[PDB]
Amino acid sequence: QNITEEFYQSTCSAVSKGYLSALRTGWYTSVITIELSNIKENKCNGTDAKVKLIKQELDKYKNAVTELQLLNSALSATGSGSAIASGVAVCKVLHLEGEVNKIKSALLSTNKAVVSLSNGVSVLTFKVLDLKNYIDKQLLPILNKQSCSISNIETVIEFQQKNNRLLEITREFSVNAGVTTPVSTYMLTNSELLSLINDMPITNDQKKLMSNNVQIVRQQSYSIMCIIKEEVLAYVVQLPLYGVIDTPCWKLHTSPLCTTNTKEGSNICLTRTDRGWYCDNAGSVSFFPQAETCKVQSNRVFCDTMNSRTLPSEVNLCNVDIFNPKYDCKIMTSKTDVSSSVITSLGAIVSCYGKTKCTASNKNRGIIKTFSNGCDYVSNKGVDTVSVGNTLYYVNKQEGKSLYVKGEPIINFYDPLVFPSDEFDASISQVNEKINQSLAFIRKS
Amino acid sequence: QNITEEFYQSTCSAVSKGYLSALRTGWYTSVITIELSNIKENKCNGTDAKVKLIKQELDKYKNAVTELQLLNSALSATGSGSAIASGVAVCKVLHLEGEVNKIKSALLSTNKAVVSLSNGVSVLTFKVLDLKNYIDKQLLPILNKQSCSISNIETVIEFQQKNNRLLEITREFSVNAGVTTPVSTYMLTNSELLSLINDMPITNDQKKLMSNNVQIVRQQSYSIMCIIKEEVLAYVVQLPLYGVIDTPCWKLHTSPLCTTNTKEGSNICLTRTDRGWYCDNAGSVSFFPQAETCKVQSNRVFCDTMNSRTLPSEVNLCNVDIFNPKYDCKIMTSKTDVSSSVITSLGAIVSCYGKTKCTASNKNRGIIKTFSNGCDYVSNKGVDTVSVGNTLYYVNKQEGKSLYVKGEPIINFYDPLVFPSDEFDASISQVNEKINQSLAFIRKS
Amino acid sequence: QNITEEFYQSTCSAVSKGYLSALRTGWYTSVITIELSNIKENKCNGTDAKVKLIKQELDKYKNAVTELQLLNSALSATGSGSAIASGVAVCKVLHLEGEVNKIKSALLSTNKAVVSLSNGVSVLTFKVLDLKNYIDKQLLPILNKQSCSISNIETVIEFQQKNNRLLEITREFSVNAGVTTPVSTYMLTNSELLSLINDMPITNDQKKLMSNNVQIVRQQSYSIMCIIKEEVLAYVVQLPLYGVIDTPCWKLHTSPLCTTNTKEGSNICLTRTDRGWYCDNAGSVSFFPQAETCKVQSNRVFCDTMNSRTLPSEVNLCNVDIFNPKYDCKIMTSKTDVSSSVITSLGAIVSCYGKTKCTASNKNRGIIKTFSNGCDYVSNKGVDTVSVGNTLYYVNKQEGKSLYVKGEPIINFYDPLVFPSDEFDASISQVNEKINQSLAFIRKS
């Protein structure tokens, strides 16, 4: 079994079944903190070049802290916006009153610890960088003098190494208005992310999914700059929670269906509008119109429910009978008979109209299929490329069976004289109720 | 007062009033220069590892300069494009003939100075990096020899520190075709940007707005690579000017309005198309259809006028009476009764149709409101989340009064048999003039 | 000659002729390899600060390698997707079985060498970094001991310099799901890219085009992370091939055309929908609807054929006679008489309707042209800016002749009572066949 595909010659559409859902439904916010060192501008009387490198290094530390302070203005938000709303809610708790002392006390003994906030949110806190312990115990005795004298270059490089992460975090936040996605390694390293997942209150099997797909979790996470307060810098990393797992998913590919009679071009067209990803979800179906929202790993589909529409489960009847009386299947009518192709999971839909050259070829055996006027389909078995006019498409070399469901093209059932041929967002019954309107004008006059 | 909100049950739309405009209307171009050092490839006879680090460091300097020279090809542009047209105009003045000597003479004594160009543009010039003074007075005597001998690692690190900014500037320009936005700290640091704002010929109050919102000025600025010429590298930072300030702004949220009779789904819908940001501007109204163009800070709305349409001030009458005879209010008709929600500034519009579960809940008190078939609205008072089907929305926790304007849903005034139910971009009178067309066909036959 | 422009008052459209095509039609994949050093975690007994800097430096090397290993999960793909399909095909060959040994043997003696793969693809292989030779011959004898003793800071900096490129490559790949575009200098330096172009099996003249436009080749290239296998890291840089060169290209600008009678606003509009870039290509015309797909250098247009539609060459007849019986010209009808402007290559189209102030001005001479109600056009000769309402447009200061083709506005030929004024995607004959439908209802009743 695994990934299969069904093409409907009747409706010029294909369905890629066999996928398993993982759907984002929740968020887990985590507060990542960096201890900072509050220091006044010292005046080391000596002009030692070893110290001058430390002084200008310290200025980059000061400018980064100041840059982070200029982003706190940023945080107030509009309007939906709901993607980071759970993380922004945590930043507001960090302001009052003040809640930072509880994070300092918990991270005073360790680096990763759980903290309960004043609004009930129990957050995993992390201490990824301790700049305060460094600059005070190893840089303070160098500048806290008249003259400078004792200073080594290993401390200059050690400072640049411990500093660098901060500069990187500030740089990413600066050119992203305080919110970045995906979450970079500098925002949260893999060892920190893998440890963070293992400590989250989630299922034992949900941990293995996020651990086996850490690169996907980053692409669906947010890093939100919160406060800079009392020798502490804090930002929230908002991790996704997948409440819908292992339910079936299928991808719908649609292409224009037009009549191909010998006339100059006076033909009627028809195109299904319900293309996108579909996944069973809580007795209904979550529909994702923008395919760029879902990321497919192998046979698994990672989507965000916030970018989805929920349809009745009867929406799948359009893939069995477009004229079913249970669900009014969505179509659109026009006369734009321009050739195009869609590359499916295990094949390619080709809508060839006019004088366009539509072929499917093998890279060593030449052309193996030529498409006639109308909507057709070819499997990826033996095919390497698809050519429509002057643009070349590459067929997916994924293994799987393709089922060609032969059927009469639906557009042939309509009389072109009575056909409403410019419906932008209609449906099957919506076209039928308009055909009856035109027939009433003609017969009863 | 401050931020308030009005919901119109009649038209399924809400207005978020109480905002204050800042609108970009102009540009201030500034030329940021880096003195470079023109050096031929020296052959230091010794293989000293301290010098080999300087030699490969110097190669990164040469490759960055060469990379900047490959971007000057880039600059010619199409086509609108008008965002950087004022900055590109300055780059063309820098080419002739040559104007760079005037920038060298002005920046020979200081770092920030005003320069008048050959085409009347008086530009604030900046000298942010002096690589020529460094490599000639501290790196030239090291390689300008047979053997190498005297060379310290502090000079190797000092070179990497003075170099780094340049490498960063070239890297950002390289992967952005010579134009970057927002303007990063490496393109122009905060102290440089804050100083640059204080020297601009603008109002005393306009300086405080840009100084208090430096992160917003960056997001609406452009860094444009100009020339590399005579031991000088120059690029233009194009800063925004806000000519419209403190005028009222309001955001319009619209949602589908459909009849909800018990039939299988044979209902007529209606949706206002004029959603977006609106701001009073010079006796008219600037309309921003793409909400992503405006950035809201607190009660202040930062927009770019180049991405806006100018409508008569009577367009606000659609928020008082959709049937007013002064302005033909824009709507669209369809039959897509699919449930959805819109999160407003101080609430949420919910369009619930069919069997979809539409609720609004508090995180500790449970469900506090359930939405019936039709278009309704709930305030953010006491509400934490909104659920429509399988997708969960977070309501904005901003403080403000919400006004529920009760009224008969406008869709109930239309006879479904005579209703043109697939108008993609129509209006109130446009639907009425089409209803009269259908009534003339039926009665006078 | 060179760049010229023709404005059609009849159809409210302008054509920017005189451009020369370069069209992507193929891909050249190149495997860029970095030799890595497989090392177990040593325990240098001494706590030497010079070695502690090497140890933490070595950890960044280990984390980057681990980060690259977490991206190999990523590679499986959907669905079209065809942009990197030729590069993904090479990554799959690198997996079996194993093909990496052939790359090691070829790059054992040199750095750039040609390799023939097991699936016939002859790929240019590159060895841009030799970390294995460094860490084994200069870092292994430092940590491969009890105690540590001999260790210099020049080796610490040398390691950071040789390391840095790798960290950069991993960072870009990490936040881009293993595929980056444009190809940065760290993925492939200019000297490497210029050398790579010179060794490709392409025409002598095609090499000069890619060498003279290396910044454009990067913007149309892809860097694809392949495998990490046997002390080797490999990623594919997918370079564009331009099979269509020096064929004519022209850009079509369209704007709404509406009647301007004195009524309240009861006017009919008409707008050509076929705007975009057009280039002659293999006896047909490649049409690029999204202008952001093509990049114009001087008079040369760089486009990707995968983002194009192929139309019959008769599509240009709409720029000579919109009513020609050979090609049914695509238009759309509405009543949205809102003022707007389009900046062409050598002028500006202005659609002024209602009470909107539409002007074209010179920066020193003031207003030089005021636009009346209707669709007009002004050349860039003497014009600096165009004002429509509250938004200001900058006209392109490119040199070239503009031809004003006077003609009766096409919208004046239609009777508003019989005009179908809400066609979303129609054509000339499509509107005529609908006008005849309404005339049959009225006369034969």
Side-chain angles (χ1 to χ4, degrees), chain B residues 61-223:
Chain B
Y61 167 86
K62 288 175 167 52
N63 289 25
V65 159
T66 301
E67 177 67 22
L68 293 173
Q69 292 184 332
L70 292 172
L71 266 59
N72 299 12
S73 317
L75 327 193
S76 202
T78 195
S80 51
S82 304
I84 66 174
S86 50
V88 172
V90 177
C91 291
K92 284 183 169 57
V93 182
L94 270 45
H95 290 67
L96 50 88
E97 229 175 70
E99 205 89 5
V100 178
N101 304 27
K102 286 111 276 300
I103 310 178
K104 271 182 295 182
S105 305
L107 301 183
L108 184 146
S109 302
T110 56
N111 288 331
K112 50 177 183 179
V114 189
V115 177
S116 184
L117 268 51
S118 63
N119 283 126
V121 193
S122 192
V123 182
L124 263 160
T125 47
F126 268 78
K127 194 171 190 174
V128 300
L129 208 63
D130 195 343
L131 290 180
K132 191 178 189 62
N133 197 35
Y134 178 85
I135 316 177
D136 297 343
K137 285 182 181 159
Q138 286 168 352
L139 292 180
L140 185 146
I142 299 183
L143 279 59
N144 242 88
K145 337 260 146 178
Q146 56 281 353
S147 295
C148 310
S149 178
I150 315 177
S151 61
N152 202 20
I153 61 171
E154 304 163 1
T155 307
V156 185
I157 304 178
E158 184 175 52
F159 192 22
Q160 293 178 353
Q161 290 299 297
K162 295 260 78 180
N163 206 41
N164 267 358
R165 172 144 191 207
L166 171 82
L167 298 195
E168 192 40 38
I169 291 181
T170 133
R171 189 195 69 89
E172 299 175 8
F173 275 150
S174 175
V175 296
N176 289 308
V179 179
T180 70
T181 177
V183 172
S184 69
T185 309
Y186 298 86
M187 296 286 176
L188 191 66
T189 71
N190 288 329
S191 61
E192 292 166 357
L193 175 56
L194 281 165
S195 173
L196 182 46
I197 294 177
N198 193 23
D199 312 332
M200 287 165 54
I202 49 181
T203 323
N204 42 265
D205 295 323
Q206 190 174 352
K207 293 180 180 177
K208 198 192 180 189
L209 182 78
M210 300 182 62
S211 297
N212 294 10
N213 306 268
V214 295
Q215 68 287 347
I216 313 296
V217 178
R218 292 184 179 272
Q219 299 183 43
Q220 307 189 346
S221 305
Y222 291 101
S223 182

Side-chain angles (χ1 to χ4, degrees), chain A residues 390, chain C residues 21 23 244 247-250 278-286 313:
Chain A
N390 296 330
Chain C
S21 80
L23 306 186
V244 187
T247 67
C249 293
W250 62 97
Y278 293 83
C279 298
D280 276 319
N281 185 7
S284 303
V285 169
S286 281
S313 56

Side-chain angles (χ1 to χ4, degrees), chain C residues 63 68 126 148 152 166 203 293 317 346 382 431:
Chain C
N63 289 25
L68 293 173
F126 268 78
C148 310
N152 202 20
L166 171 82
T203 323
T293 325
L317 297 176
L346 307 172
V431 173

